């Protein structure tokens, strides 16, 4: 083919491909072939182009549901998915559940959440050093939180985790495998909301079931798909992001010691580490211009698709000083770790709360925390659209 394959390469730990910094400098918007659908997409590497592709009404995610649209993942996007709804229906779909995810209702969770983190750190001191931080904190903590929030039975963790890993496949699985799991996840979630039909609950699944009986603008598929989106995102992001921030802290240990030194640096350290880490391994859900749109170096034509690399916008030397350097004393940090525009993460305040409480708790109660397995053998998850560790053995 004429144009290059994206992703450019199999990923390495949390390392940014050095082609991203080259593209930022000399070819900020470049033709790429995505691993699925047909044709070519524009890859967007710098912050101001990213803010436009994510920000502007001229770009449609709905339009990207066409099976022939380029995408990073094997199944054509599900049309009832939030990510694939354009405003204003997108705005109506997000109000179903938005109430619960406002910064103010998330601040109210801090105590419940800080207890939870204390129990799990109790059970780790009980087991004794070494222990797998994945096993004792990363997985059970966030899984417990969205289970309480959604009203999903904690006893289903092995069930929904397996569905959730399959639906975040890049290469590990095939279209037919994933499409199968989508159907199961749909039918499962449809069943959990169904149980609320006679017995409404003080729950987001509760709210989703209420919405199914009375709403006239949203399909049952949209409302139920909402519950799967929140159950996947609500654990998959935080589970990976706790291993990623711990990996960044302990592999140049000065950082971890800087937070043990001052545990009030932890909210700023979280934002800085959200900026620094390619949690999304490559690309994004795709946006198709509905009209000509001007970017820094090119006019994207109506019908041309675009894809963003969040981690590369977060390294743009024209908005962050010493961008390739980890710094907890940055005066300003306008990162897009949580996206931008209508699809800006609903969970951003929750993911902040969960990461703050996990790191505060560690950095206060375990000053002696060190990686007790070698860097070279670290089990980075492979062939998923997200990055994170399968395990993280730590001593103290
Ligand atoms: C550290 C945690 C998190 C990170 C880094 C993260 C990152 C992101 C990013 C970058 C997007 C935008 C994708 C795009 O527009 O193409 C996004 C969207 C989303 N995130 Fe998060 N997220 C996190 C936590 C959460 C949590 C805790 C939830 C749910 C409880 C969640 C649910 C979502 C949902 C549903 C979307 C799609 C929203 C929409 O289409 O309107 N995320 N997230
Ligand atoms: C399964 C996810 C979906 O649950 C979303 C809402 C969860 C997370 C928080 C996201 O929204 C996430 C940032 C995705 O947009 C990307 C990982 C993208 C490459 O993957 C996706 O586009 C995939 C296929 C989505 O459907
Ligand atoms: Na897409």
Numbering used by the authors: 12 to 407
Text from the published report:
The bacterial P450 OleP, from Streptomyces antibioticus, is an epoxidase involved in the tailoring steps of the biosynthetic pathway of the antibiotic oleandomycin. More specifically, OleP catalyzes a regio- and stereospecific reaction of epoxidation at the C8-C8a of the macrolactone ring. Among the known macrolide epoxygenases from actinomycetes, OleP presents a unique epoxidation chemistry since it targets a non-activated C-C bond, which is a reaction not easily achievable through conventional chemical synthesis protocols. In addition, discordant findings have been reported concerning the timing of OleP activity during the tailoring phase of oleandomycin biosynthesis, showing that OleP is either active on the aglycone intermediate, 8.8a-deoxyoleandolide (DEO), or on the monoglycosylated one, L-olivosyl-8.8a-deoxyoleandolide (L-O-DEO).
As observed for OleP-6DEBHS, high ionic strength conditions (I = 4 M) induced the crystallization of six copies of the closed OleP–DEO complex in the asymmetric unit. Higher ionic strength (I = 4 M) shifts the equilibrium towards the closed state in crystallo. In the closed state, the substrate displaces the sixth axial water ligand, with the macrolactone ring adopting the correct orientation where the C8-C8a bond is parallel and exposed to the heme plane, at a distance of about 4–5 Å from the iron, which is compatible with an initial attack of C8-C8a by activated oxygen species formed at the heme iron. In this position, DEO induces the formation of the helix I cleft, showing the conserved catalytical T248 lining a water channel that might enable proton delivery during OleP catalysis. A critical contribution to the correct positioning of DEO is provided by carbonyl–aromatic interactions that involve the carbonyl at C1 sandwiched between F296 on β-hairpin β3 and F84 on the BC loop. Only higher ionic strength conditions enable a unique positioning of DEO in the active site. In the latter conditions, a network of hydrogen bonds that forms between the C3-OH and the C5-OH of DEO and solvent molecules trapped in the small cavity, the solvent cavity, of the active site, constrains the substrate position and bridges its contacts with the enzyme on regions directly involved in the open-to-closed transition. Although not determinant for triggering the closure, these water/formate-mediated interactions contribute to the stabilization of the closed state. In this analysis, L-O-DEO was docked into the active site of the closed OleP–DEOHS structure using Autodock Vina 1.1.2.
